[PDB]
Every structure is written in structure tokens, then in C-alpha cells.
Structure 1
Amino acid sequence: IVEGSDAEIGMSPWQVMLFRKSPQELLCGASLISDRWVLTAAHCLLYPPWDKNFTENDLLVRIGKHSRTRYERNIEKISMLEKIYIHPRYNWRENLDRDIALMKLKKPVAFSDYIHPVCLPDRETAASLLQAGYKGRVTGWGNLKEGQPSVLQVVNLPIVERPVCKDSTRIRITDNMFCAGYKPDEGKRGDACEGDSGGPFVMKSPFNNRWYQMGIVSWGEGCDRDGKYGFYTHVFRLKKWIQKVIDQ
């Protein structure tokens, strides 16, 4: 997060850290959607252009964290992947279309004040809140610069209109993506940055007071570049795949 602010304690309890066992480094963000399921970007696990192809035995899920680097004893919970699922049609070759994976944890995790899952939108929720001008919130331990937080950062950002998104890049934007960020004019900054991918884009419902994850941090070009925006996976468009792997 570039131009974000320090998260308050317990502000994002669904916020999960994706951590490399060896060498021990942060890979990406992710979110907790249940007690055994974690939602992240597929590009966090698999990206052939960069020889990246992480396995289940390769990583650790750390939930309940505030601090980037300390091991928060008695607060945070570290778990093991029982299995990883990438969307059969994730497009790494062209545009990172369908950048979404599900992780099944080796054991259910218990909820505390620091650990609590986020809701997944239902069709009418996505309809009323996934609108241009409406702000969503991203959190992450990623670069604060186009360098590292000591604590979880937040930034609130507006969703931008499809046309403006399409005209700011050369990449082919699909119906499974939405972009978010301020216009150079609005002259407000903030953006995800390296380290932040796979974390959640979330909105609070004005009807029932809940937090809904609407996007996943996917791709962008630079951090907090003018006229460029963040691309996020459209979680409701992929909802039916998500239910599929969870019941099956």
C-alpha cells in the first residue's frame, strides 16, 4: 500500500499473510472466507514466466496478524495447506484473467477478536455496491513505494468506470476484472503495491452492516502511477466456481 495508513488492531480479521517457508519471506495477501478456506490470486501460486509454481508443502498461511515480521505469539495462527486449487481457466499467458485460487487448510482455524472471515457477495449485493465512484478498501503488508511497512496498511479507493479502465492500459480487460484508483485530477493517491497481491478489496453493506470481499488484488502497472489503476478479480463473476470447489 502506497499512501495508505496503519490498520487499527482487529480492523481486517479476514486478512491472511501468505508465507514462504524457505527462504522465509512474504509472498502475498489472501483472505479467510470460512474456517478452512483461504481466497487468493492464482498468480501468487503459479506464474510460469517467472518460474513460479508453489506447492502445498511450500508455504504457510498466517492469520491474525498486525505486524509484518514479528511472530505475534498467542495472537496469530500459522496453518498448513491441505490443498491448492487454481481456476482451470486462469490466463497467465495473456492477461491474468481468472486470477483466483482457493486453499483448503489442514485444520479449521478458530475465530478470536483478530481472526474472523469476510462474506462473499450474493448477486444483489454485487449489484448495489459494485458501482463507479463507490469506495472499497485494500489492506496488505506490501511495498509503500513504487519500502516496507512495520504494520498492516489500509487505503480506501474508488471503483473507476470500465471505459476509463480500458483506456489507461494496453492489456485486454475482461468482464472478470474491475479497476480501482483515483484520477490524476481527483488528486488523491493510494494503491496496492508488490506484496499486496492476493489480498482483499472489501466494501461494507449499508443495508446489513457487513463486510463483503468484492475483489482480489490482481495486477497494475507500477504503484500509484498517474492515469494507471489497479486491476482486481471480480469475485462475484467467479462465485459459481468458488461454490463448486467448496462443495465437491
Structure 2
Amino acid sequence: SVAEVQPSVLQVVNLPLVERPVCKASTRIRITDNMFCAGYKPGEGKRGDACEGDSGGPFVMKSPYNNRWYQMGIVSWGEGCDRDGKYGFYTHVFRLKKWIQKVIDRLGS
């Protein structure tokens, strides 16, 4: 089962990490060190973005050092999907890592 707009199968897109000042300047919202933006810039021609229903999913990277996948982000929000001049915002996992280890190491760590 399916129908266009909603995939029948798992979708994948690889997107670049955008520099902070750019992210910060792309939105009227109050960005924080706890989120990062990714996506293609208008002068690049390639497209792609997360969209409604992608929330909570992982934003991973593969280390060229050891060949493992690391979860760098979580789909949070954006302003529409794949709009020129706008970026997708993701939770900054490494930055919330202390809290993660606190709750897993039973409210201590």
C-alpha cells in the first residue's frame, strides 16, 4: 500500500552540514548551540530535505577513521520542505550527550 506524497519504502538523502552563521541568518527563529542546520544552498543545484513525518529520525555520519556510523543529529524542525534559502534543523546529539548518559547510567553520569 501507498500513494504519492507518502513513500511505500524507506527513503534516504545525504545532505551537507551548513555553517552556523548561514543557518542563524536563514531564520527569524532563535537558533541555539543545541541544534545544527544541513541542506543544499540555492547556488548548488542539488536538493533534498527532511519533511513532515521524518521527525525523530537519525542524521548519521560514517567515520573515515574507523568505518562506523555515528548519530550526529535528530530531525527536529524546518520551515516547509526543500525551500531555497532555508535549512532543516536537527538536535545536536553530541551536545546533549551528557544528559543521555545521565539517564542511561541511572540518573548518574
Alpha-carbon displacement from aligned partner over 1:46-86 (angstroms, at most 9, x marks no partner): xxxxxxxxxxxxxxxxxxxxxxxxxxxxxxxxxxxxxxxxx
Deviations 1:192-219 (A, max 9, x none): 0000000000000001000000000001
2:27 to 162, 169, 186: 169
In percent, how many aligned pairs have the same letter?
A: 92
The structure-2 alpha-carbon separation of the partners of 1:196 and 1:163, relative to structure 1 and needing over 3 Å to count, comes to: same
Higher strand share: 1
Which of 1, 4, 10 lines up with 1:152 in the alignment? 10
Measured in 2, the distance between the counterparts of 1:196 and 1:241 equals 23
Higher helix share: 2
How far apart are the structure 2 equivalents of 1:170 and 1:208? 39
Coordinate RMSD, CA, aligned: 2.4
> Is the Cα–Cα contact under 8 Å of residues 146 and 223 in structure 1 kept in the other structure?
no
TM-score by length of 2: 0.93
Counterpart CA distance in 2 for 1:194 and 1:152 is: 14
Change (3 A) 1:163 1:198: same
Equivalent residue, structure 2, for 1:186: 44
What is the deviation of 1:187?
A: 1.3
Aligned residues: 106
Large movers: runs of 4+ above 2 Å: 143-146
Structure 1 portions without partners, runs of 5+: 1-142
| Bigger radius of gyration among the two | 1
CA distances 1:102-139 after superposition (whole Å, capped 9, x unpaired): xxxxxxxxxxxxxxxxxxxxxxxxxxxxxxxxxxxxxx
